[PDB]
Design a protein around this ligand. Structure first.
Ligand SMILES: NC(=O)c1ccc[n+]([C@@H]2O[C@H](COP(=O)([O-])OP(=O)(O)OC[C@H]3O[C@@H](n4cnc5c(N)ncnc54)[C@H](O)[C@@H]3O)[C@@H](O)[C@H]2O)c1
Length: 120
């Protein structure tokens, strides 16, 4: 069962969507993190073990609850409506030597949208 999240005071300190480098490029280019198979986008308070990309949602955006409908399951996982990339606070990628070309792409699209990228 899910309960509603309607006030910023209920948002954790960070809200993270774990993914890989190929999805985060598709995410930025299509303009939104979409629920896909599931009915909601799954977010971890701050994931698949193979997730090397971490998308931080800006929990302090004045437009947060005008853009997302937010829920929380009893085991503390946050479920949301489509998240526009413009609500993305920061994208953190664990670098792999094999993905150096994709990261240059990610660097450009994120700058074009003024989303900061951090490579660890
Ligand atoms: N992703 C997280 O950080 C997170 C948070 C908490 C728990 N979980 C757990 O993980 C499972 C959910 O799987 P999931 O979160 O990987 O999602 P999912 O299994 O439904 O797979 C959807 C995939 O599509 C990607 N995607 C989203 N928007 C896209 C777009 N516009 N273009 C291309 N790709 C896009 C997502 O990043 C994700 O990799 C559940 O068991 C859930 O409890 C996930």
């Amino acid at each position: 069962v899910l309960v509603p999240i309607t006030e910023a005071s209920q948002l954790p300190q960070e809200l993270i969507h774990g993914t890989n480098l190929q999805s985060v490029i598709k995410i930025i280019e299509s303009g939104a993190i979409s629920p896909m198979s599931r009915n909601h986008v799954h977010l971890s308070p701050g994931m698949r073990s193979s997730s090397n990309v971490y998308i931080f949602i800006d929990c302090h955006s004045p437009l947060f609850f005008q853009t997302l409908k937010m829920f929380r399951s009893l085991n503390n996982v946050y479920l949301s409506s489509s998240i526009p990339v413009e609500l993305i606070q920061k994208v953190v990628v664990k670098g792999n030597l094999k993905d150096e070309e994709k990261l240059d792409t990610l660097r450009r699209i994120l700058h074009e949208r003024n989303i900061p990228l951090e490579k660890i």
